[PDB]
Design a protein around this ligand. Structure first.
Ligand code: NAP
Ligand code: FOL
Ligand code: MN
Ligand code: MN
Ligand code: MN
Length: 159
C-alpha cells in the first residue's frame, strides 16, 4: 500500500524556495509517528531540503542522476522506488510536489495536515478529486505557545 503524507498551507502551498517557512512542532511529531519504521520515498529537491537521512526509516531518493551519498538508497524511476521498499505493509511518500503528482494515482491513503497559514509558495500539493477520498480521521487543534497556527490532522482513504 502506498500513502502520501504532507502538510498544506492555504491554497495547497507546500513549499517556497525549497524550504518550508513555518515551524509547527506538533506536525513534525505527527510526521515522525506516522513514518517511523517505514520506508520513505522523496524527490531529490526534498532530500536537499531535509539535508540528512531520516533516522529509523529506509530513505529512498528519486533522481535521474547517480546518487551522491551511500547512507540512502537512490533510484531512477517510480517502479524502482516501489521495488526498493520490499514487501512492507505501507510505503510513505514524503514529497515534494513532482513526486506527490506521480504517486497520487497509486495511493490508497493520504495523511494531510491543513495549516491555517497564508505563505507565498512556489510548490503545491496536487489537485486531488474530493469524490475519490473518504475522511476517516480528523483532529483540529488551536494554536498554542509552541504552534503558532491552528492545524487539522486528516487521514483520507481512497473510496
Ligand atoms: N509541506 C510538505 O509536506 C512538503 C513535503 C515535501 C516537500 N516539500 C517542499 O516541496 C518542495 C520540493 O518539491 P519539488 O516538486 O520542487 O521537488 P521534489 O518532488 O522533491 O523533487 C523533484 C526531483 O526528484 C527527481 N524525480 C522526481 N520524479 C522522478 C522520476 N520519476 N524519476 C527520476 N527522478 C525523479 C528529479 O531529480 P533530478 O533533477 O535529480 O532527476 C526531480 O527534479 C520544497 O519546497 C520542499 O520544502 C513540502
Ligand atoms: N505533515 C507533514 N509535515 C511535514 O513537515 C512534512 N515534511 C515533509 C518533508 N520535510 C521534512 C522536514 C523535516 C523533517 C524532520 O526533521 N523530521 C523529524 C522530526 C521529529 C520531530 O520533530 O519530533 C523526524 O524524525 O521525522 C521531516 C520532513 C514531508 N511531509 C511532511 N508532512
Ligand atoms: Mn521503467
Ligand atoms: Mn514483492
Ligand atoms: Mn495562521
Amino acid at each position: 500500500m502506498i500513502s502520501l503524507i504532507a502538510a498544506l498551507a492555504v491554497d495547497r502551498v507546500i513549499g517556497m524556495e525549497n524550504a518550508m517557512p513555518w515551524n509547527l512542532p506538533a506536525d513534525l511529531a505527527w510526521f515522525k509517528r506516522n513514518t517511523l519504521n517505514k520506508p520513505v520515498i522523496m524527490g531529490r529537491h526534498t532530500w536537499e531540503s531535509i539535508g540528512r537521512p531520516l533516522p529509523g526509516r529506509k530513505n529512498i531518493i528519486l533522481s535521474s542522476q547517480p546518487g551522491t551519498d551511500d547512507r540512502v538508497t537512490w533510484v531512477k524511476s517510480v517502479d524502482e522506488a516501489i521495488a526498493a521498499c520490499g514487501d512492507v505493509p505501507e510505503i510513505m511518500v514524503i514529497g515534494g510536489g513532482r513526486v506527490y503528482e506521480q504517486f497520487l494515482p497509486k495511493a490508497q491513503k493520504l495523511y494531510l495536515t491543513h495549516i491555517d497559514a497564508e505563505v507565498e509558495g512556489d510548490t503545491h500539493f496536487p489537485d486531488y478529486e474530493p469524490d475519490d477520498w473518504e475522511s476517516v480521521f480528523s483532529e483540529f487543534h488551536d494554536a498554542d505557545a509552541q504552534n503558532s497556527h491552528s492545524y487539522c490532522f486528516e487521514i483520507l482513504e481512497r473510496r
